[PDB]
């Protein structure tokens, strides 16, 4: 019943006595599968998980500078040298400055100057690699077994969870009295992860192309670089400016967080649950074999007592109708008489039922159930029950 | 002597017996002004200050979000409303979500949802206005009065400081025994501040155009908005995204510090000393009247004792020569005999002197002085002194 209320709901009808039905499960969608003499089953791809991602590279987008130092030499005294030129954590540049008697040189002219500053990253982003073998799809199954909305549970037979991976694309879910349903899916179908990375920055996540990621002009440290990082291409965020042949100063460029966010406008979004990555985009083609699917209550005898609407029947966005009733009898489990008719005399069936074999299951009194009906276009009467105590509700579609 | 050693040094020669000389002072430059029967004077525009700047506008380039809240209504129950819609510190958006029996609604369909979040600025930039009346130029004057390099001072007559503003563009500096020099400058000349703002962000400063500043797409609060700011156009850094007709979430764009830094690549830089803005760019055209300028030691008698080089004469970047000597006599103050000659017999003068009237001033023994000479192209002899004890140094230019 998990598809009732979902706007992006697709209806797939299988052959009567058919063996398998082909379906396409999409994130945000829900499929209600029906077949003659078979129970109606809702199927949904709920999560796509990427596990065991390996860190590929980290890019510094916000940097800071500390510990500025300089070495100077007089004209004709050669090139200046600073010990920090041998520390990979410092960035350095050489230039020429005006020197003479006024600033301690025996000669007038250009003297060599080197300036260094310690690079440290304030804020960085991390690209992790994806291995096609590790993604795992989770599928939720909910049978239309006449359970009422608000089905609290005290292994629920109405629900099943199925997990399919590229190395195990086939599964079978047991549904208790309904038997079991088989799923043979095609996880190979979809977007190719051969050139896709998982990018994380400031707790936001994307899927990006590998070549684009390798070509971004930022400082970067290797995936296996742990602890204190060693930053390559620090000059992408650090620049030296000279002023009036007197000084040179080093400035750090501002955060490029906005720039990457802008470059990521046309990119797929993601989230993370713990060390696992969660995707909210994609699809999955499956073929479900239903030879082992059965109707649980096809053998019940009909309910004889009276039903009572506990809620007003409500139209879903697709024109289907939901009916919730209460039963005051004790002969449960039993079949619920439920139909649609334009003529209260003939009771000739019009339209069709979506939930096959609606049934009350409890033997205790005052038990509720819910079913779903597919009325014909125009006016009709929802008829529940038999004989004098049958209840009716006139419903009009379009 | 403040121009000795400066690479960007310009030489301006005035008329002999002339009244005024026109000069162009630039930041990073230095001018040595000479005239017959007049002392040689170095002049430099050292600082350009903008004071009393008024705050025009502040732009938020790094924002954060807190206190997310939502209001929801069932289908046909109308539009949702949140109290935070009446708080200017919150940004809000409305959308439609799938509702039905499963999530507490009597009807199936689209229900109204509003989501709000409290906007706060992490990092902002400030644009201040500039009034042409308030900038002030500071000019340093250093006479070539035969003072030696390393002139420590125990009101120095060799140096003068002059300040000129648009409302007082004329000044006169007193130089003790040299008289006084007048400056009539044209501060109106230069870049027009009618459409120029002073932009400050992350302790870096620029001069930007007014229209560009008014059109930047960021949240902004008014210059007179003090204390807790009220941010206009918060939507420039805040956006709402929907997911699967289930939720909407609000994200803040990353820091645009890099973007503005990039847009400011072709822009003039500045610094700040306290509440005053300092400019390291611009020029200033002046006309200096020297009718009151005089040679201090033109009346001295010549030195009779011997001189001694205390440093090796050194060539400046323009081909001029510096000579520092020590005097072991006591007849100071006296004129220093100093000349250039190719023939040690005739002592016919060749070339010319840059420092007019070189003199030793102290009456105490072993006192030092420094002068500057403009030799002819080729070979020559620097000759200091008279008679047997005169000293020579052969110097070749180009």
């Amino acid at each position, epitope marked *: 019943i998990r598809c009732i209320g979902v706007s992006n709901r697709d209806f797939v009808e299988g052959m009567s006595g058919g063996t398998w039905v082909d379906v396409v499960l999409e994130h945000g969608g829900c499929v209600t599968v029906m077949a003659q003499d078979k129970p109606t089953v809702d199927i949904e791809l709920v999560t796509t998980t990427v596990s065991n991602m390996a860190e590929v590279r980290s890019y510094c987008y916000e940097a800071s500078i500390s*510990d500025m*130092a*300089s*070495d*100077s*030499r*007089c004209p004709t*005294q050669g090139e*200046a040298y*600073l010990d920090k030129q041998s520390d990979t954590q410092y960035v350095c540049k050489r230039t020429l400055v005006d020197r003479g*008697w*006024g*600033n*301690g*040189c*025996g000669l007038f002219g250009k003297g060599s100057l080197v300036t260094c500053a310690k690079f440290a990253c304030s804020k960085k982003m991390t690209g992790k690699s994806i291995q096609p073998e590790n993604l795992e799809y989770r599928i939720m199954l909910s049978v239309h077994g006449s359970q009422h909305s608000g089905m609290i549970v005290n292994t629920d037979e109405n629900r099943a969870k199925v997990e399919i991976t590229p190395n195990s694309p086939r599964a079978e879910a047991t549904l208790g009295g309904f038997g079991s349903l088989g799923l043979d899916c095609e996880p190979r179908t979809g977007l190719d992860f051969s050139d896709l990375y998982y990018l994380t920055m400031n707790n936001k996540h994307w899927l990006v192309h590998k070549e684009w990621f390798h070509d971004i002009p930022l400082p970067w440290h290797a995936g296996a670089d742990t602890g204190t990082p060693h930053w390559n291409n620090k000059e992408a965020l650090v620049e030296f400016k000279d002023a009036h042949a*007197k*000084r040179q100063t080093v400035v750090v460029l501002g955060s490029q967080e906005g720039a990457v966010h802008t470059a990521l406008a046309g990119a797929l979004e993601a989230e993370m649950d713990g060390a696992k990555g969660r995707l909210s985009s994609g699809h999955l083609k499956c073929r479900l074999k239903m030879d082992k699917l059965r109707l649980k209550g096809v053998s019940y005898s009909l309910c004889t007592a009276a039903f009572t609407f506990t809620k007003i029947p409500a139209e879903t966005l697709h024109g289907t109708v939901t009916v919730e009733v209460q039963y005051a009898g004790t002969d449960g489990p039993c079949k619920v008489p439920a139909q649609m008719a334009v003529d209260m005399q003939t009771l000739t069936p019009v339209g069709r039922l979506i939930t096959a074999n609606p049934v009350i299951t409890e033997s205790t009194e005052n038990s509720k159930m819910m079913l779903e009906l597919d009325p014909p276009f125009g006016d009709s009467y929802i008829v529940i029950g038999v004989g004098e105590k049958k209840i009716t509700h006139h419903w009009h579609r379009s | 002597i*403040r121009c000795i050693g400066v690479s960007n040094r310009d030489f301006v020669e005035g008329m002999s017996g002339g009244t005024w000389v026109d000069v162009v002072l630039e930041h990073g430059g230095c001018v040595t002004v000479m005239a017959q029967d007049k002392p040689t004077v170095d002049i*430099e525009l*050292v*600082t350009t200050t903008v004071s009393n700047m008024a705050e025009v506008r502040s732009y938020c380039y790094e924002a954060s979000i807190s206190d997310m809240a939502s209001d929801s209504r069932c289908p046909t129950q109308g539009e949702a409303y949140l109290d935070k819609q009446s708080d200017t510190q919150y940004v809000c958006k409305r959308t439609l979500v799938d509702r039905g029996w499963g999530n507490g609604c009597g009807l199936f369909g689209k229900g109204s949802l509003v989501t709000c979040a409290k906007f706060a600025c992490s990092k902002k930039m400030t644009g201040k206005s500039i009034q042409p009346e308030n900038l002030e130029y500071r000019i*340093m004057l250093s006479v070539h009065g035969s003072q*030696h*390099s*390393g002139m*420590i001072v*125990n009101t120095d007559e060799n140096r003068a400081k002059v300040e000129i503003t648009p409302n007082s563009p004329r000044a006169e500096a007193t130089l003790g025994g040299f008289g006084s020099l007048g400056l009539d400058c044209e501060p109106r000349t230069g870049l027009d501040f009618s459409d120029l703002y002073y932009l400050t962000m992350n302790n870096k400063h620029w001069l930007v155009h007014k229209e560009w500043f008014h059109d930047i797409p960021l949240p902004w609060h008014a210059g007179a908005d003090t204390g807790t700011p009220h941010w206009n156009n918060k939507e420039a850094l805040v956006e709402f995204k929907d997911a699967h007709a289930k939720r909407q979430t609000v994200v803040v764009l990353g820091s645009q510090e890099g973007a503005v830094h990039t847009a400011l690549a072709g822009a003039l830089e500045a610094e700040m*000393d306290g509440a005053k803005g*300092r400019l390291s760019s611009g020029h200033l055209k002046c006309r200096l009247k020297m009718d009151k300028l005089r040679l201090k030691g033109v009346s001295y008698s010549l030195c009779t004792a011997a001189f001694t080089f*205390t*440093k090796i004469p050194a060539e400046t970047l323009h081909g001029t020569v510096t000579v520092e000597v*020590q005097y072991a006599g006591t007849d100071g103050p006296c004129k220093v005999p100093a000349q250039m000659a190719v023939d040690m017999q005739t002592l016919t003068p060749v070339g010319r002197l840059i420092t007019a009237n070189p003199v030793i001033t102290e009456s*105490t*023994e*072993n006192s*030092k002085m420094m002068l500057e000479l403009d030799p002819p192209f080729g070979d020559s002899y620097i000759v200091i002194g008279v008679g047997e004890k005169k000293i020579t140094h052969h110097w070749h230019r180009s």
Partner: antibody
Amino acid sequence: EVQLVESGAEVKKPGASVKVSCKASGYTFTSYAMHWVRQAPGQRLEWMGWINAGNGNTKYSQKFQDRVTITRDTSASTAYMELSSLRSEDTAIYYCARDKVDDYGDYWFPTLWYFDYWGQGTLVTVSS
Amino acid sequence: ALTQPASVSGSPGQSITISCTGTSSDVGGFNYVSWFQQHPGKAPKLMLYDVTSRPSGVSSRFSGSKSGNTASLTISGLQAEDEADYYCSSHTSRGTWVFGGGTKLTVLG
């Protein structure tokens, strides 16, 4: 007349922090950088660092890079030297000594006559 | 870091020389060589700056020179007032300052 007057002598424990002051009079304080040079009893002088009184920029010796902080109050025309994580080796007389800033307000190269005037010195004794 | 003799002595009237040896990064590199005199209990006094130049008020009996990496302070006509400790100093290529070990000058009484 140029004078540099420094705060009184101090006795402190190892691991403590000392702040000694240096008030300048007789000259324009904002035109000069103030240096801190110390001297253990019977030992040589050791340059510790300097502060540009005009704009607040500092330069420390790499051996004192972490433990020293030099600051200034312009209204009081006073420089301050703060040494933290004291050890027994810091017992010394601490002098301040000025040198002129350029006419652009930057202190990049000293004047050749640097340290032309010195304060009288402050004895600080670090012991437990 | 700068090596100068621990003590030098001379008779009144004689001349003496104090050497100050550095490296190509402080003394042999720049003219920022200064000489300071310190009397016991008093702050240092600048005697020589810019290896040859003298500040006003210092007797011309004090003179300076420099050759290669070694600077020198010569004091002629020694007087008993000259007994003090003498420290050379230099600005370095790294923008720091270095002082010598100090020389005790004794005018022999």
